[model samples]
Target: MSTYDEIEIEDMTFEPENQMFTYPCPCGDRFQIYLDDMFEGEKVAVCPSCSLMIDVVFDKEDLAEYYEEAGIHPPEPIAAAA
Candidate 1:
């Protein structure tokens, strides 16, 4: 019997090399948004598809609320840029 048998571990490593350093949109693309070495929340970046500003990060609940207000369905990944 192994002590680790009943325990499960999730890998939460940060891989900057394979990570997306920049995000692309329909109108314009944006590089990484950082604040004091941390990713900023609720930051809007230009959309290359529409040339419109789109929210990149926000509280999940708040995002749901906004989507509801706009009568739009929220995506599963939640962090996707429109």
Candidate 2:
């Protein structure tokens, strides 16, 4: 019914192959969110087997390194092309 907590991107486990971030959930499962979604202004990470969610804290600039490490180009910004 509500968010569990706020977690920073640096504290989560990054799966480069999956391009996903995960953190341990209280329900014995893990909270999961995707990199692409984050870049698109998403902040919620949800548990697969529970009703718990978390707010992810991050900056757009922080994501570039992750994308580079994954060997994928980051998405082009819709604004700011000058």
Candidate 3:
């Protein structure tokens, strides 16, 4: 079971070096998630210092470009890391 409040995808920032998609949280902290999770339908990003979470609204078709920018080998990168 999981839950988070929805936030528009336009507000997030992409950090290519870290493969991070992050946004501001209400707790004066930031909610962060990886690109794979962001593209794999994982919508909840939580703040490490607090109990707050956010729901990211994104387009599935748009992931390819970000993945490309990050040099992700399509299909899955987490697999190659393990």
Candidate 4:
């Protein structure tokens, strides 16, 4: 099982591309998780290049607003690699 730590929502960067919210991992990579991943009230974000993970604390009611900011339906397509 993965260990977890807490991160405030203010620290997260919302990327519309993947509808993902991320933070800077101490490992110098992004700690990320898709909004869909938070659908069931999950709060964990994992570092893309490290073992570190963070639990994002957010308001359930505010998620819709964030979703609006993300501006896509569920399962938004991944951005094509350049």
Judged by lDDT, which candidate is best? 2
lDDT of 3: 0.69
* Alpha-carbon lDDT, every model: 0.34, 0.79, 0.69, 0.73
TM-score against truth, every candidate: 0.26, 0.78, 0.69, 0.73
Q: Output the better candidate (1/4) by lDDT.
A: 4
| Model 2 spans > 4 angstroms off | 26-28, 77-82
lDDT tens per residue, model 3, 1-82:
3654776666777677777778766666678867777766787677777766767777644566677776777754442232
lDDT (0-100) at residue 66 of candidate 1? 40
Query: Tens-digit lDDT track for model 2 on 1-82?
Result: 6666888889988878888788877776788988888887888788877767888897766687788776677566444346
Best by TM-score: 2
Using TM-score, rank the candidates from best to worst: 2, 4, 3, 1
Using TM-score as the measure, name the better of candidate 1 and candidate 3.
Answer: 3
What would the per-residue lDDT of candidate 1 be over residues 1-82, giving only the tens digit for each residue? 2122111111122123433223433334443322212222424433344444333443455434444543443435556557
Count of clashing pairs, candidate 4 = 0
| Candidate 4 Cα outliers beyond 4 Å, as residue runs | 1-4, 26-28, 74-82
Global local distance difference test of model 2: 0.79
